[PDB]
Amino acid sequence: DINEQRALIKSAHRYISEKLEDHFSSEFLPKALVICGSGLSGISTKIADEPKPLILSYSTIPGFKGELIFGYMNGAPVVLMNGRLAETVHPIRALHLLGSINVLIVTNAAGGINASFKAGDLMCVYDHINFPGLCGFHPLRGANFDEFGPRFLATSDAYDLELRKLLFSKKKELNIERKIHEGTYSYVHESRAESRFLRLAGTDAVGMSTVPEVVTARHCGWRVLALSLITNECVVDPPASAHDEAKASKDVQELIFSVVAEI
Amino acid sequence: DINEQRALIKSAHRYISEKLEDHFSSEFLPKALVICGSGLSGISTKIADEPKPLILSYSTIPGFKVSTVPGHSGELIFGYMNGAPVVLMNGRLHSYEGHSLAETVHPIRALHLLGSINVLIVTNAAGGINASFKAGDLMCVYDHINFPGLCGFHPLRGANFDEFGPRFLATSDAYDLELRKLLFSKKKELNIERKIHEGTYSYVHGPTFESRAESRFLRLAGTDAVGMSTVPEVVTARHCGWRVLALSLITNECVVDPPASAHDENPVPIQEGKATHEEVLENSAKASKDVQELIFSVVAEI
Amino acid sequence: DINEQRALIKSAHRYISEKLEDHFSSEFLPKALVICGSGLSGISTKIADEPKPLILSYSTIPGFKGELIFGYMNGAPVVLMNGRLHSYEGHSLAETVHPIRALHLLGSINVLIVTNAAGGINASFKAGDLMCVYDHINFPGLCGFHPLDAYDLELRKLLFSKKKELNIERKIHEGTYSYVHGPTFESRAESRFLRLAGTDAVGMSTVPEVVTARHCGWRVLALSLITNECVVDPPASAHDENPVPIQEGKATHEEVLENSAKASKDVQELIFSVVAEI
Numbered sequence: 001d002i003n004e005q006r007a008l009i010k011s012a013h014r015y016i017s018e019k020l021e022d023h024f025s026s027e028f029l030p031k032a033l034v035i036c037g038s039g040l041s042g043i044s045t046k047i048a049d050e051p052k053p054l055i056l057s058y059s060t061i062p063g064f065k066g067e068l069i070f071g072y073m074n075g076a077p078v079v080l081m082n083g084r085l086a087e088t089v090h091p092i093r094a095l096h097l098l099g100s101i102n103v104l105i106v107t108n109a110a111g112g113i114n115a116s117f118k119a120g121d122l123m124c125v126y127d128h129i130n131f132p133g134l135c136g137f138h139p140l141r142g143a144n145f146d147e148f149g150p151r152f153l154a155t156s157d158a159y160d161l162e163l164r165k166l167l168f169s170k171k172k173e174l175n176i177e178r179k180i181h182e183g184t185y186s187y188v189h190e191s192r193a194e195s196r197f198l199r200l201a202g203t204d205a206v207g208m209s210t211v212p213e214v215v216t217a218r219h220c221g222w223r224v225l226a227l228s229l230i231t232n233e234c235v236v237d238p239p240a241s242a243h244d245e246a247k248a249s250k251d252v253q254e255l256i257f258s259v260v261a262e263i
Numbered sequence: 264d265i266n267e268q269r270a271l272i273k274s275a276h277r278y279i280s281e282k283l284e285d286h287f288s289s290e291f292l293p294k295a296l297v298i299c300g301s302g303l304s305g306i307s308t309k310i311a312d313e314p315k316p317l318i319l320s321y322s323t324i325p326g327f328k329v330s331t332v333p334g335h336s337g338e339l340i341f342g343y344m345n346g347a348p349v350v351l352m353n354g355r356l357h358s359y360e361g362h363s364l365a366e367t368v369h370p371i372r373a374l375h376l377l378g379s380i381n382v383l384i385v386t387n388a389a390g391g392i393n394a395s396f397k398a399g400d401l402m403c404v405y406d407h408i409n410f411p412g413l414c415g416f417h418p419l420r421g422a423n424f425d426e427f428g429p430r431f432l433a434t435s436d437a438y439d440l441e442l443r444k445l446l447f448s449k450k451k452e453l454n455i456e457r458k459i460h461e462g463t464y465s466y467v468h469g470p471t472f473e474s475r476a477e478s479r480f481l482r483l484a485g486t487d488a489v490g491m492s493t494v495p496e497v498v499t500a501r502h503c504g505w506r507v508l509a510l511s512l513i514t515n516e517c518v519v520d521p522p523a524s525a526h527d528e529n530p531v532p533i534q535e536g537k538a539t540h541e542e543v544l545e546n547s548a549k550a551s552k553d554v555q556e557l558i559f560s561v562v563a564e565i
Numbered sequence: 566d567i568n569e570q571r572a573l574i575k576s577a578h579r580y581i582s583e584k585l586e587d588h589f590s591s592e593f594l595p596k597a598l599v600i601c602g603s604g605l606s607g608i609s610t611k612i613a614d615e616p617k618p619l620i621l622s623y624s625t626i627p628g629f630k631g632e633l634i635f636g637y638m639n640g641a642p643v644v645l646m647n648g649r650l651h652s653y654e655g656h657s658l659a660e661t662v663h664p665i666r667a668l669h670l671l672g673s674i675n676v677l678i679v680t681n682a683a684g685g686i687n688a689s690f691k692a693g694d695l696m697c698v699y700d701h702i703n704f705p706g707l708c709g710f711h712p713l714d715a716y717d718l719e720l721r722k723l724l725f726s727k728k729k730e731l732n733i734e735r736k737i738h739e740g741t742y743s744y745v746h747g748p749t750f751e752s753r754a755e756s757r758f759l760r761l762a763g764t765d766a767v768g769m770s771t772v773p774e775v776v777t778a779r780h781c782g783w784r785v786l787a788l789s790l791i792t793n794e795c796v797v798d799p800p801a802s803a804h805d806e807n808p809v810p811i812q813e814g815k816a817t818h819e820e821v822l823e824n825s826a827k828a829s830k831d832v833q834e835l836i837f838s839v840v841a842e843i
């Protein structure tokens with residue numbers, strides 16, 4: 001089970017590393033993996049046309065259940081995951097074997113739970129609640145990959161302070177007027193009562209991605225920067241009583257483009 | 264399948280029972296199962312040399328799964344502690360290792376069939392969520408939160424073992440009052456100064472330590488200490504009709520403050536105070552002698 | 566699995582549809598499905614004698630893991646589910662809602678009326694009160710357990726108008742039902758948690774049926790019978806010299822069944838009145 005998972009991770013790396021060497025004139029050693037969430041596939045446009053980026057379809061990569069994009073962004077070599085529990089984070093581990101990536105930048109679309117948030121706002125993630133992981137669906141469940149990281153991983157330090165300071169500094173410099181908050185992302189696998197529960201539980205934004213990748217990247221020792229696009233404000237007010245009578249993506253693109261040059 | 268689970272339970276029992284009958288000259292009828300938590304395997308040193316104890320490796324008993332952790336694979340130790348026949352589970356299984364909850368509590372079912380055990384004494388290490396707790400303190404468990412259980416991961420899911428207990432088990436009475444009073448009486452008798460709080464333990468799956476927001480969530484939900492075991496064993500023992508005494512060692516203080524903000528002028532490093540397994544083990548080791556002596560005293564009076 | 570799940574649902578519909586054709590002289594097209602929860606089998610007595618109702622045991626219907634009763638109630642053609650399935654029994658959520666998906670294929674049902682027993686979490690509720698459900702919290706759904714605006718306002722108003730018309734004194738609250746997996750009754754700390762989470766009543770069923778009915782395009786009316794008041798007080802401390810016994814007030818299935826049966830006549834009268842205006 002872990003033996004087969006290890007072999008598939010090594011096969012994926014083996015394949016990827018070979019394709020890089022055949023494609024690039026110099027060693028390609030990406031400093032970051034960028035995961036483009038829903039509606040944010042335009043991050044790819046920010047990849048320079050020279051040298052010609054390398055594109056591998058997931059179908060072609062051993063053990064990948066979409067495409068991987070290898071190229072330069074603002075002078076830095078990166079990999080983009082265009083589209084996306086053990087198997088869902090397999091790509092992170094396969095890419096870790098390249099031995100160059102030290103930052104995961106992950107973007108997603110999320111529902112606004114914090115009452116201050118409005119659609120179109122951004123939220124830099126500085127904490128998370130991994131609801132399925134508290135219960136029994138967890139990317140690290142099973143035998144530990146001892147070569148990658150520890151059996152018991154702290155997550156109180158999951159969201160790098162310097163990367164967050166960097167993101168905000170870059171926003172003020174490109175003078176982006178879009179609202180950006182800092183808060184807690186809750187991962188779940190939506191009623192008024194459930195949204196109310198999420199709010200009182202401490203949720204600022206909610207969605208069904210990101211956290212398993214953040215946990216897996218942290219397990220590998222990477223730094224993590226995570227950014228949510230608030231697509232809508234969830235309603236928390238009770239139903240009526242029977243007794244009664246893509247502008248965002250553009251901004252995300254430029255933020256990330258700026259960020260990676262200092263990564 | 265339940266008829267498959269019954270067969271595995273009956274098989275484990277038969278193996279264990281036959282081992283005992285061949286090892287001890289008097290019928291061995293343990294009154295308590297003691298489950299030893301992280302860093303507390305020292306409890307086994309309280310088993311007397313005479314009569315010779317019996318040690319059964321998990322790897323040799325049907326249905327038992329071994330730890331994925333080397334080389335602590337886990338063993339059942341049958342012997343006399345302070346004159347009382349007991350069985351110790353030296354090592355427990357955790358669901359984060361990849362075992363089903365049913366697998367982690369199978370030994371309780373198998374041992375129930377000996378027909379003598381009426382008390383579970385369960386120990387564990389836990390992170391302190393209650394702000395007043397400090398590493399080194401003990402907490403006597405008088406209540407729990409089974410959040411994974413509410414959400415679909417429950418050791419009693421499936422056809423009910425009607426031979427053992429009710430389809431619908433109350434848990435508002437899970438933590439016997441007289442055993443908790445016994446525990447505190449022994450603290451007094453032994454002049455142990457270590458604090459023993461009383462409070463609520465929450466089971467979470469792991470294997471990550473909790474984020475700040477998760478810990479804040481557990482806190483607002485009423486958690487005093489958090490760990491990755493114990494609750495499914497308690498529930499299963501209760502299903503079998505045993506009384507339960509549960510004792511947590513607070514091995515670390517969960518970090519619950521919001522992380523440094525990007526806007527903060529003098530930020531606290533987000534790594535400050537982070538939990539590590541090494542801190543848990545070293546703190547378990549420091550408190551082990553007190554835990555050993557408390558249990559040694561308790562088993563003579565059950 | 567999925568293109569085969571579809572086959573089992575069609576197989577169930579074929580079985581049922583032919584049994585109905587064989588049984589009734591005129592086309593029988595039920596407009597409501599009533600799911601009879603814990604201790605509420607008495608609904609069956611409200612089915613009229615003429616035309617004779619058809620009973621189908623769950624054991625003879627393809628894919629069903631109880632009985633289905635097809636007949637007229639207060640002039641309305643309905644189906645009753647006498648017995649429901651629960652995830653704590655080891656059944657997948659898909660298996661627990663299979664009967665709804667099969668019956669949807671008749672193309673005639675447009676209302677689910679679902680009843681259940683529930684523990685009272687709201688401090689003001691008493692055993693014997695009813696609660697009309699207007700919202701829910703799906704706890705297993707947080708982890709992705711899933712069978713595949715929910716609770717019709719006009720049906721809720723209809724329920725209250727019938728309580729008034731029938732002079733039923735029994736209290737009917739309106740509030741939030743929390744679905745938790747079971748099969749244990751909640752600990753004191755768990756019940757206090759549910760209360761702070763916004764729960765008014767707690768139970769181990771219903772939500773997956775509601776979600777499935779909505780997916781099939783049906784309106785939903787859900788009624789909980791409060792059968793017991795959940796214990797919330799912290800248990801006796803070892804330091805208390807005058808402790809309240811930890812067993813005091815504990816939930817039992819016996820209490821649930823007895824209290825379900827006591828409220829059953831009122832619930833039957835309500836549902837009987839409602840289906841005629843569905």
Ligand SMILES: O=c1[nH]cnc2c(C[N@@H+]3C[C@H](CO)[C@@H](O)C3)c[nH]c12
Nearest residue numbers: 431603682683684767768769818821
């Ligand atoms: O206090 C409660 N907690 C959770 N569920 C129920 C229920 C509902 N049903 C009743 C049945 C156990 O009596 C089981 O299927 C859950 C009644 N009271 C409670």
Ligand SMILES: O=c1[nH]cnc2c(C[N@H+]3C[C@H](CO)[C@@H](O)C3)c[nH]c12
Nearest residue numbers: 152301388389390489490491540543
């Ligand atoms: O802060 C905590 N959170 C969750 N569990 C534990 C435990 C119990 N542990 C011990 C072990 C990790 O150190 C693992 O099996 C769960 C001690 N401290 C904490």
